[PDB]
């Protein structure tokens, strides 16, 4: 059932079916003549798309084309994504989405999402009231300060929330109409954008006064006021300072989490857990060195500690196995560079000698695992990689910074320089690597896309009010538990991306069972079969009938 | 004043302004938050477009991009076309529009126009009633049987009426909302399309029974019943047989004309009229030979006769100067191949010897003017062109068949082979030609786009009921009268394409003055200054204010 | 926010303000010119209404006029009701609503509510999907078999759910857009209606097959499927058999109650609880005799027992003090007339002699309290009343059957025949009575209107899932606790009807606090101050601004 008929049905991508509108639907809904005589199936439409995509050359050109369908025919858009999520992920998500954002103003055609600028302070609710959908259940918001490892892109960062939410639906079957991408515009410090005639935001530097916090507050209140107190709000790509303080400030008041801190933490742990299964290495022999000490590093470290603790280690001893090296060097007690409360637990007494470079840090500390999360480029140099391979029989190397150009190192560099002995994972995709001896290694992608879709679905379906760290610990376990022995032997630390749909649903199932078992679910009545309940609630890309109910009376 | 507010204003390309909506319009119309904070000018938007277009490679890719804008922001679409009509004409019109039609079903995104199929017989009115616009003033309809010189493309032919109408607006300032592209689908004989899974029409051979004629009758009736008996109906790309009979059948009952017979007839004459001024040749000495004897040849021949008649020659004398050579050879009394009543006046007693090829026809008849209108490819061979150059000092050579691949010959071939002595014109665009002696020749485009926009505007504004042949004779004179002596010397047989807007308006002005003088206009009150009236009535691509009228009460 | 503009805002009674639309709203929303130049306040509008009402003569005429305003200007409709609820209650509610119902098909103008017929079996969800409001929270449904004490009125009974819901808003401030009146039409056994050409329902006798139960099931499921499992569903005026059956069947599965069994039970108990205070009578000396043994009698008796039990008596002891006399006579063990499980607890060993009439029952049993609830007219004859006055110093006499003509006796009869010693209450309104000694007695109205509004508000605000009997016991205490000692001496057994609004809110507050204290509330976060929370959530009749948020950017 839909209230609009005629042309409006075609102009609205949510309802538009193109030539898939049946003859009966066309005649009854006033579309006869507005569409070519041909009646098509979604299959034919999907074929038309794949035929055209194949003739395209640049990833960006493909991004514009596919994302364009989200604004023409929503059902078809998700069908297309669903046909081959693995081959399209690189286009609609990292790394291409990063390219899209850097040139967002140049490729603009139609707006996507909700825009709230600091100039709208005191009027946010009226803006939230302008969103057409009334049953929003999930929001992904960014202020564009830390877009991937690209930095401050301001309003051009909107491409991120839009991308994340496309994955909510494509990966976890979350209803598109229940999702709302939001961009908070308080200005940008990117000088180049301030001089770009195509910039889509306020031409001012970022407002870092109390007005900033107040706007975010008005945003949180406005969203929940209209849609409900348990509306899921996923903070995405906020700067380091703001990311933590907002998480700390709102996690016990609203249903919210930060993808970059918590989502990335879960996927990383999941990979480390998979690696532990292939190496069967002693938790006591684990020495983890982080390249970076921000949102991801701190998030990951904290989840790692929670894991070691549940495994018979004290919080203190677990923390001692973790070191961090930020842009100023190793986090050691008494260093010149600042150390906040979050970093304190991982800041140890300075070792014998103090390293100047990350390479020095690797040789002095002799870590068994190295995790790259500095979003600053190829910091895992060939020498850093060799060091890890000479020190460890099976070194674990994670280059998680996105997009591809910001990655610490490539899959080819890792596998070749370690003679195929490393266990590698990255945030951005790399194809398989073949060494001179003929062995082929398939790098897994430690990207939060394996986590937020499933966690979002569970939280939404259970009407969860708040998200604890343990929820992400569980998602991590749920992710790695899906790896098959065969896949582990392949060098895979994560289930194949081609199966991300089924993987996300299983995660959702495992997390909802966890929520119920820990009194964090508030749905009634409580379904008896959680798995069956989640699977039944998923949105489908198949067209629905728009025919009015017609029948004879006795 | 608009009756819609909110998202719908953005979903409707007619009203959507993208980031050009002012802050007040957004706040008052409920769009705040739905658009990026940025407020843009149409100039910036036009800049964004040209920036992107410049990076594209194939003409079809550009066609898809520009025509896509027509479905997103109509004002911008026409602003873009008006910015540089000359460089985009080859993309939205011939030859690219022919390529677009050939694969219309493959590049399909959104439907454009009204589709009426034979399966809708008896229900055409309900289809016409589904069109959202209430004030249609002009219709361009095709059945796709004779799409340019490409043949039967069926429903894929819809691309033609759409393009013609874009030009109604772009060239003559006719309101887009008053235009209606129509495709009559009675099936198609194109075997390739019948086996094409992306075909957009009925999968059946063309219905050539009484049902066909009845459907066309129902169409005419339905359009005029809803929009008025004086609604302009421009038949476009119909097959030979049908084209003439429908013109004869409806020209005195409805406000209708056939672009291929009459429009093309006027452009051709216009070029011949221009040529006569550059070489000052007495038409008693003009011997014209047509390659083809169909819609265009007969249309052109009839207008030529009318021109010679008003210039002191008897109809008989004028017709004797015209010869035609179709796919069976020279039209001569007593030939085996059929000769209908339209061709009879130009079928003369066989010459001394009967020609086998067009080349033979040229050498035996020794024409001074050769007009290619067979839509069959390069029939004006190098030898044909050489023959015209040896027989005449300044041969007139017209290769009017579209698209480019169907043209009788290129500008390069004509100018070079005649050593720059020919007066050449083509239906499809060719770049300037530079001969070994340094002389540069700029070929004119004798395409009906120089005629239908101006004639359509005059007929619409004058509420004309029927269109006589004389109207096209006048349009032809109006076109050529705009050539300046300096342009004649350039080898220009038509005003520069870059000036098609003002050229179309001036033609419209001359035609309306002609309509009033001949009691064919029915407008009340009758404007005293026709020129001023026409120019004031033209639709503009500048954005209109959508703000409600707000003011204070005393 | 408002998604509509122009004429539609005036055609929708929910938004229409008449001349109360401000100049700014008219100009910005496109209403300028569609309304007289005059700008009016709701005060002036209310005056216009009262001015006209005062000139009317019949109650039904007034009913048609006021109810018509609900379909023209909803805000004004409730403002009017709020101005003088006490004087209008008899018009919009009992007894006039009874008359309206009997002639519903004759006074019909616009339909109100949702209609679901047996002929729609299997298609109920599509009917529910047609209701315009998306946030329904409460439903009052009837099948019209037992409308007041009038019997089977079929679809004409829709007047009841409509009236009841008008009171949800007028008395408890429940949002009108969140209320849905429903009439289930499975036919009617009322012969007169089946021959009435203005009848509004199916022309068939009641379907009492399995199809009936199935339809009600489909109804419950469809309502909750669209609006939520906790949607409040108030059954109203269903026949005896079905009333209990559906209450027992759905009370633990849905959020539902039967107004006639539970609502009436609470208001009656409240009256008795008030009488308790005016005469300080020992519960052991309480001898109660019901005239009737159906929906109301059983409901009231059960609640009375719960009250005595909570006060130191065993269930058995309490039930022993209650006797019932239905149409076949006194409910005694072994009588010929049927006795079901609900009546068994009040069916005692036959007394010395078996009474023929209710009068005999009074003389043989010598009850101290008499409760009339047989919906059969003046069964409390002058002799019955005298018997109660001769047997008791201060007899308690309740004539609860509606409408007025169906009441067991009038207030005049009660007070005069008992010489002002009786404590009287009725379902339908009676004016004050003055005896010959000059004493004035003000009869209270023991009608469930004092209960369902407050209970509905509490259940809705607390998102309560199911309603226990104890909730009605609490509502009863909440109602009576509102009486001041001053009022008790005035013969008051209920707070003044003129204060019904504050009385309902207070009942709503007490019930919500009861729900929270007994883990039956599921709202979060839980408000600290329940009274403040409830009062802040109430819908107000004051016009709201419809102006779009316009403001300057810095
Ligand atoms: N050149 C560098 N060498 C080592 N560490 C660096 C270097 N450059 C930046 N870093 C560190 O990387 C961390 C970035 O933290 P931030 O919170 O900004 O992002 P993040 O969440 O780690 O980002 P990502 O999304 O890339 O994982 C900081 O601790 C910073 O000191
Ligand atoms: N190979 C050929 N050589 C000479 N004449 C040809 C040849 N092929 C086709 N013709 C002629 O060209 C004419 C085409 O007439 P038709 O009515 O189909 O289209 P048209 O409008 O005249 O041409 P165009 O499509 O170029 O505008 C016919 O008279 C046909 O006999
Ligand atoms: N004439 C009568 N004398 C005594 N009892 C009667 C008489 N007529 C009907 N009754 C009884 O009144 C009761 C009516 O029960 P029912 O469930 O139909 O409605 P109710 O909700 O109790 O009545 P109301 O809503 O009018 O107060 C029955 O037990 C019936 O036997
Ligand atoms: O295949 C279709 O009908 C739609 C294609 C698109 O919107 O690109
Ligand atoms: O420049 C714009 O705002 C619109 C571009 C488009 O529709 O392609
Ligand atoms: O910011 C990132 O790199 C991400 O979310 O994957
Ligand atoms: O048909 C054609 O070639 C035209 O209209 O230009
Ligand atoms: O049925 C009744 O009389 C009532 O509900 O008031
Ligand atoms: Mn991120
Ligand atoms: Mn044509
Ligand atoms: Mn009732």
UniProtKB/Swiss-Prot annotation, chains A, B, C:
Binding site for a divalent metal cation: 236-237, 260
A single BP term in Gene Ontology: pyruvate metabolic process
GO MF annotation: an example: metal ion binding
Gene responsible for this protein: ME2
UniProt-listed PROSITE patterns: MALIC_ENZYMES
Catalytic activity, as annotated: (S)-malate + NAD(+) = pyruvate + CO2 + NADH; oxaloacetate + H(+) = pyruvate + CO2
Activity modulation comment: Subject to allosteric activation by fumarate.
EC top class named in words: oxidoreductase
EC number, UniProt record: 1.1.1.38
Binding site for NAD(+): 146, 240, 293, 295-296
Subcellular location per the Swiss-Prot or TrEMBL entry: Mitochondrion matrix
Binding sites annotated in the UniProt record for (S)-malate: 146, 402, 447
Record carries keyword Acetylation: yes
N6-acetyllysine modified-residue sites: 137, 205, 221, 253, 327
The species this protein was found in: Homo sapiens (Human)
Subunit and interaction comment: Homotetramer.
Binding residue positions for fumarate: 48, 72
Protein's name in the database: NAD-dependent malic enzyme, mitochondrial
Swiss-Prot/TrEMBL keywords: Acetylation, Allosteric enzyme, Metal-binding, Mitochondrion, NAD, Oxidoreductase, Transit peptide
Tagged with keyword ATP-binding: no
Family (UniProt): Belongs to the malic enzymes family.
NCBIfam families: PRK13529.1
Entry GO CC: intracellular membrane-bounded organelle; mitochondrial matrix; mitochondrion
Active site (record annotation): 93 (proton donor), 164 (proton acceptor)
Cofactor info, note text: Divalent metal cations. Prefers magnesium or manganese.
Other observations noted: This isoenzyme can also use NADP(+) but is more effective with NAD(+).
């Amino acid at each position: 059932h839909i209230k609009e008929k005629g042309k409006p049905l075609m102009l609205n991508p949510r309802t538009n079916k193109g030539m898939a509108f049946t003859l009966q639907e066309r005649q009854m809904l006033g579309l006869q003549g507005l569409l070519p005589p041909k009646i098509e199936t979604q299959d034919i439409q999907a074929l038309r798309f794949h035929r055209n995509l194949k003739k395209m050359t640049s990833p960006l050109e493909k991004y514009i084309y596919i994302m364009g369908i989200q604004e023409r025919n929503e059902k078809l858009f998700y069908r297309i994504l669903q046909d081959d999520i693995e081959s399209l992920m690189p286009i609609v998500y990292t790394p291409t989405v990063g390219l899209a954002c850097s040139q967002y103003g140049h490729i603009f055609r139609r707006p996507k999402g909700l825009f709230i600028s600091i100039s709208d302070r005191g009027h946010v609710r009226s803006i939230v009231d302008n969103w057409p959908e009334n049953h929003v259940k999930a929001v992904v918001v960014t202020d564009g300060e830390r877009i991937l490892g690209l930095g401050d892109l301001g309003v051009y960062g909107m491409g991120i929330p839009v991308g994340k939410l496309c994955l909510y639906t494509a990966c976890a079957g979350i209803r598109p109409d229940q999702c709302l991408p939001v961009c908070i515009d308080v200005g940008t410090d990117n000088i180049a954008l301030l001089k770009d005639p195509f910039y889509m935001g306020l031409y001012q530097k970022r407002d870092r006064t109390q007005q900033y916090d107040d706007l975010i507050d008005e945003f949180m209140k406005a969203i929940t006021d209209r849609y409900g107190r348990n509306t899921l709000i996923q903070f995405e790509d906020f700067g380091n300072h703001n990311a933590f303080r907002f998480l700390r400030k709102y996690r016990e008041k609203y249903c919210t989490f930060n993808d970059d801190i918590q989502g990335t933490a879960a996927v990383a742990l999941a990979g480390l857990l998979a690696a532990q299964k292939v190496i069967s290495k002693p938790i006591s022999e684990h020495k983890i060195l982080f390249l970076g000490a921000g949102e991801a590093a701190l998030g990951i470290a904290n989840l790692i500690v929670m894991s070691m603790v549940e495994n018979g280690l004290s919080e203190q001893e677990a923390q001692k196995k973790i070191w961090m090296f930020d842009k100023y060097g190793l986090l050691v007690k008494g260093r010149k560079a600042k150390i906040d409360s979050y970093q304190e637990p991982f800041t140890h007494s300075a070792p014998e000698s103090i390293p100047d470079t990350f390479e020095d840090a690797v040789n002095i500390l002799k870590p068994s695992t190295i995790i790259g999360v500095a979003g600053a480029g190829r910091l895992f140099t060939p020498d850093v990689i060799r060091a890890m391979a000479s020190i460890n029989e099976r070194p674990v190397i994670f280059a998680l910074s996105n997009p591809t150009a910001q990655a610490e190192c490539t899959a080819e560099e890792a596998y070749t320089l370690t003679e195929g002995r490393c266990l590698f994972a990255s945030g951005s995709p790399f194809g398989p690597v073949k060494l001179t001896d003929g062995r082929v290694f398939t790098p897994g992608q430690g990207n939060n896309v394996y986590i937020f879709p499933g966690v979002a679905l569970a939280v939404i379906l259970c009407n969860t009010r708040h998200i604890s760290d343990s929820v992400f610990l569980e998602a991590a376990k749920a992710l790695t538990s899906q790896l098959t022995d065969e896949e582990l032997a392949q060098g895979r630390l994560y289930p194949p991306l081609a199966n991300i749909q089924e993987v996300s649903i299983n995660i959702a199932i495992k997390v909802t069972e966890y929520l119920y078992a820990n009194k964090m679910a508030f749905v009634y009545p409580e379904p008896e079969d959680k798995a069956k309940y989640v699977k039944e609630q998923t949105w489908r890309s198949e067209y629905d009938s728009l025919l009015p109910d017609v029948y004879e009376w006795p």
